Write a protein that binds this DNA or RNA. Structure first.
Lengths: 121, 111, 50, 44
RNA sequence: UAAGUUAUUAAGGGCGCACGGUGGAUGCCUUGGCACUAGAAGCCGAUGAAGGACGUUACUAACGACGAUAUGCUUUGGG
RNA sequence: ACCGAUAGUGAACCAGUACCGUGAGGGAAAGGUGAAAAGCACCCCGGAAGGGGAGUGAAAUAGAACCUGAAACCGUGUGCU
RNA sequence: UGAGUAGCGAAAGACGGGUGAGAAUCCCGUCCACCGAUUGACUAAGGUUUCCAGAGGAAGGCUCGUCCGCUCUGGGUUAGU
RNA sequence: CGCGAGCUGGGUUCAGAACGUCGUGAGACAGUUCGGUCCCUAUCCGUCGUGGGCGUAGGAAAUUUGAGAGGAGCUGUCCUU
RNA sequence: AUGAUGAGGUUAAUAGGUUCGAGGUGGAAGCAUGGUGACAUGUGGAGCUGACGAAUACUAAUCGAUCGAAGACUUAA
């Protein structure tokens, strides 16, 4: 991988799957600059798969994405995959890559570690 | 004249606070708020307090313009230390010094 | 190892020459007016405009 | 490691109590010599 | 132009001085002790001792006083 | 022609006490605002603590950490270098 | 002084939303991971009020803390077997 | 008899046990044999790498010369004459 | 190691994404077929693919700020 995140391989992969699911559930999250520099490249490729649409492209999405349900569909219950293949894909069906953007906030207290707001473009 | 504010017996070792104080010493006081507001260090908030108090002693109870104010003299002195213990191995014991500081800031108008 | 001889308080202050910390590298926000930290989002009021 | 003090109320009172000091000539000497010094706690 | 001479910088440090902080020496002081002198007196307890535990107050952790009559009761004197 | 708070009793102060030990036993440290609490109303900064004023006081650099306040040590500025 | 040096005591957290002067750490939630002849349930000794609620954040907590086995104020232990 | 704050602990000289032997004995060797905790976070000089300051009589970018200093330096065999 | 060194900061290919390849693996899922079943074959050198090459401003290198010279002295030309 590009940069080990101070974690181990299984632990880091779990970290990144969780961050990617949370990003496409909340559409913007505040994290650390390196975690964001990695979640960037993960969710880019997930939404590429979503834009493809085919069934194999769905089962490949379904391995690097967690199982949360979006209760707040106003009584509707989407899974994260249904979200990613309807809403996120249909939204970004025009642009050729570059689906997020990171914004530095400043030094978190307790670490001094920079905080970023990674969100969907 | 020359207004001053003091914070006596703050719970930070004084030579960690002197780091931050060596930045605002001599700056236009309109800058020093933002400088202390933007830096990583931890002694910055408890100095922002003292600075804003010494600047609120200029408008009130004297009559000065708080744009005309440079940080003439900032500094930090030692307070009373709290001597604690830390058990090392094999029955040994090592003393700890939870030190304090007195943060003094003096803002002026140059008149 | 142990120090063979205590450090004179001149040598202490010579060693502590470079222990200073640097400025934050800040700019004036063109919207907030107040100061921001370059390439960061204005804590005081609103957007980043970049 | 098992350390040397393993508390026990029954043993503590059986071997250092008041009634066990009041049973000897020397236990009585012990209590008198703690009263000469004026201790708060005589026995244990 | 060429050949020569010479500094100003002080990141810092040195000495002198001015001004501050910690710290509790010194100065003065006493509700405390030390060594004696003169005078008493030198035992208490089965009619429960010395010593304690537990309590007692309008609000009571503790100290002194007190004992279910308890932060005290009667009387004899002084004040 | 004794001590004067590291002295004098271990103990000037809730001391045979904190504390230490299974136990016998060992055992400290700790005084001082002012003549009088008059112990700082009210305003301002601050979440508070702490400050700056205004006050009390003869004195607040006498503000309960409260007589004087040394040295170590730590700082801020400058005259020569 | 050494020196802003060594150490911060085996290990998986993430994010959203709250609360708030201040949040990596406090509360909630979803996901993820760990134990599961035990990191679960009940008890003897021993500790002795640490148990609970509402407030607090000077000290303790190897950081932070709005939190706590900590500080304050109130409470809580029921037997013929 | 270079080098244990670079490494080892195999022998020799810690406590155990045994053989031969000397000693009445506790025990000892001319000896022999099985087993047997090797701690240290580098302050100064030194060394090896790397930055900052000022200087190099204006402020810069680039290319260089070389006073010096370091590196290398070994060797066989087969064919021809 | 950090600093430094280089490559860039939109008038821009510096990194990420995207579309192509390179190399690596070794024939993806679904479907149809044959087997009663484990399976096999075709669709099809397919599908996936971290670090390598190329193109593409989609995202982020925004806006700003600081430091930095005015050339001493003689003597000869």
């Amino acid at each position: 991988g590009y940069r080990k995140l101070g974690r181990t391989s299984d632990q880091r992969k779990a970290m990144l799957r969780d961050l990617a699911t949370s990003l496409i559930i909340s559409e913007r999250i505040e994290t650390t600059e390196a975690r964001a520099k990695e979640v960037r490249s993960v969710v880019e490729k997930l939404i590429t798969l979503g834009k493809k649409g085919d069934l194999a492209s769905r089962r490949n999405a379904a391995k690097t994405l967690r199982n949360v349900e979006i209760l707040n569909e106003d009584e509707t219950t989407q899974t994260a995959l249904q979200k990613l293949f309807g809403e996120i894909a249909e939204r970004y069906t025009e642009r050729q890559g570059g689906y997020t953007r990171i914004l530095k906030q400043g030094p978190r207290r307790g670490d001094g570690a920079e905080s970023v707001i990674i969100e969907l473009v | 004249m020359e207004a001053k504010a003091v914070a006596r017996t703050i719970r930070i070792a004084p030579r960690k606070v002197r780091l931050v104080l060596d930045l605002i010493r001599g700056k236009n006081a309109a800058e020093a708020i933002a400088i202390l507001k933007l830096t990583n260090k931890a002694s910055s908030p408890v100095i922002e307090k003292v600075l804003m108090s010494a600047l609120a002693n200029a408008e009130h109870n004297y009559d000065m313009n708080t744009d005309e104010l440079v940080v003439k003299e900032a500094y930090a002195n030692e307070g009373p230390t709290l001597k604690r213990f830390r058990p090392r191995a094999q029955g040994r014991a090592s003393a700890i010094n939870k030190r304090t500081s007195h943060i003094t800031i003096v803002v002026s108008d140059g008149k | 190892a142990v120090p063979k001889r205590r450090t004179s308080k001149t040598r202490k202050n010579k060693r502590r020459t470079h222990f200073k910390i640097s400025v934050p590298g800040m700019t004036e926000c063109p919207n907030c007016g107040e100061y921001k930290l370059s390439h960061r989002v204005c804590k005081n009021c609103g957007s980043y405009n970049g | 490691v098992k350390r040397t003090y393993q508390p026990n109320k029954r043993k503590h009172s059986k071997v250092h109590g008041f009634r066990k000091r009041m049973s000897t000539k020397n236990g009585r000497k012990v209590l008198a010599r703690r009263r000469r010094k004026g201790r708060k706690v005589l026995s244990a």
